[PDB]
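Training component of the fellowship. As part of building independent skills, the fellow (R.M.) carried out the full modelling exercise for a liganded target. The chosen ligand was A3E. The inputs are recorded below so that the supervisory panel can assess the work.
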Amino acid sequence: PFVEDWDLVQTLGEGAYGEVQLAVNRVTEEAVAVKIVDNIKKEICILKMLNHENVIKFYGHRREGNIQYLFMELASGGSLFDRIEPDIGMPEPDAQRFFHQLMAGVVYLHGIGITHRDIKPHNLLLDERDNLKIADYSLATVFRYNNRERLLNKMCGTLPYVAPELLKRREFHAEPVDVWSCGIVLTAMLAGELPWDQPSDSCQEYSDWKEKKTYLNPWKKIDSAPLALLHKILVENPSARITIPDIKKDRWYNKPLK
Ligand SMILES: CC(C)n1cc(-c2cc(-c3ccc(CN4CCOCC4)cc3)cnc2N)nn1
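Fellow's submitted model of the complex:
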């Protein structure tokens, strides 16, 4: 349980992509996280680009035979997932703060031409001051390079978080897909429940939303101001969907909260 100066003291995450260990340096006592895996070339390359307070820092990597070691910022708060009370959510002001921090993260990624592709509470970690960090770049990819956008075609992510275009279109724009998933995260924070299994015309809950039946759950647990924002985010047509610059002008986004 040791790689060079570091001891691998306990497990933080398991199986998802290899496993995540708490790494404590026996000399310096500094603690980091280490992702251990038995594609990784791409992930490492994207990881080396990331420099922002709401993105997980990459420290470096060591290959030791079969096993790759990715040293990363430790987020000792654990995940957003664990702060969401099932069926309840969390207090609206804590949700708003996390949403602000999530948008700052996403703007940053998009600005360097990176799309995360699997935004959800498991991948949103918290430092010891409750600062949000976007983690896990194993599905991340370049969508803008030398100022030219490339459309995506791989279907990936997590179904309850994916945008509907990803199930219907041969190719689609990256940015509105990440925006959509941020809106399902906002729903989850505010209601402690996901609104649908997947955003397909065969999913009854998704049909209900498109028919504006917001007297059903989870929408009826959400105040009208954040709900008005969720109406602009979870819009089926990605070219009509709100963009982040416009999210930042929204009334609830700018509402002062406890
Ligand atoms: C997304 C993937 C899962 N991952 C996780 C991490 C990561 C995870 C943690 C972390 C994970 C869990 C806890 C607390 N637990 C113990 C395991 O029972 C769930 C709660 C605390 C920190 C800290 N720092 C990271 N950098 N980095 N990448």
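The panel noted the following from the submitted structure. The longest helix spans residues 92-111. The longest strand covers residues 6-15.
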